């Protein structure tokens, strides 16, 4: 499944940030992110796509100080090509979510839980 693929890529990222000591930025600093609420629909994945820009910069920066993230680019590329499929056929819909404060780790965990909840409904 496509949603199956997205979940994996997120969990892979979370794994790296939890196992590699020098990946400190995604672990220690909070940013204002779009987080998923109880409202859960494939349309809401636009919110995730809007954050992919910033996320690449996070990974690129972490890479430059810790040479343990060589595959930063196509990581985001993989994520982007998977979410665009799930979004469905629609004019891009402005993200309708609240803007909340969290670390990159917490950000991933909440989009992971989002994916897992969809899987349950299908």
């Amino acid at each position: 499944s496509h949603l199956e693929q997205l979940l994996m890529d997120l969990q892979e990222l979370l794994s790296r940030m939890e196992n590699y000591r020098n990946l400190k930025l995604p672990r220690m600093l909070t940013f204002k992110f779009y987080l998923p609420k109880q409202a859960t629909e494939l349309k809401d994945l636009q919110c995730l796509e809007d954050e992919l820009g910033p996320l690449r910069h996070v990974l690129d920066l972490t890479q430059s100080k810790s040479f343990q993230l060589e595959d930063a680019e196509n990581f985001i590329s993989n994520i982007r090509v998977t979410v665009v499929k799930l979004k469905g056929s629609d004019n891009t819909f402005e993200c309708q979510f609240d803007d909340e404060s969290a670390t990159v780790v917490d950000f991933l965990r909440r989009w992971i839980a989002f994916c897992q909840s969809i899987i349950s409904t299908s």
Partner: antibody
Amino acid sequence: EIQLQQSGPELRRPGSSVKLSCKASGYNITDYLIHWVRHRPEHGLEWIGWIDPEDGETRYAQKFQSKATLTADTSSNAAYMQLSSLTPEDTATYFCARSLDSTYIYPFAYWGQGTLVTVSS
Amino acid sequence: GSDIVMTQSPFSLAVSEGEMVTINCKSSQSLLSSGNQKNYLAWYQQKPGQSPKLLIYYASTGQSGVPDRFIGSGSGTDFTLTISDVQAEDLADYYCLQHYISPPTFGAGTKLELKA
């Protein structure tokens, strides 16, 4: 050569606090992470949290975020763990351990002799 | 509920000297890293009166000084610890540990006893 010496046994009433110490010798405690893991004979092994003694970063299991506070002192070459709001379920043997590599956070190795903490109603 | 669950079996085991022992660990999630191509799993041994000691990390790689009788195998969600030609000194508790995603979690353990 690498060793982690833990402080002695403790006795506490419920609601109390305890601070355990983990003194490193044979190496500089800054170079690796310090993990804390407890053992309860009926519940097995349970990871509590880790700390990076170089810059002080801490990571906790959600179960212990309010209860526990990890700490290091570079001068003493030592790490510390404090548990507050103790309950009888917190009766355990508390181990400190070191990360295996300097680069990777897990797994833990070179464990201490353990500190027995007994909480009595 | 979010935590990765380690189902370790068997709980207790008694065998004779020289026989082979099989400990199984099953995970609720794959522990394989897609980039590293490694499984984030370790095995610990706790002899009576002693602290836990690392036997095997990354599923199949033995720690220095660990005899060859100890073989870790497996991938994804199914893992196995093997002890061949089991010795009197192997009397201990054995735990699997995952660390693919925090918090790292232990299996319930395996008590191993030896007989003549």
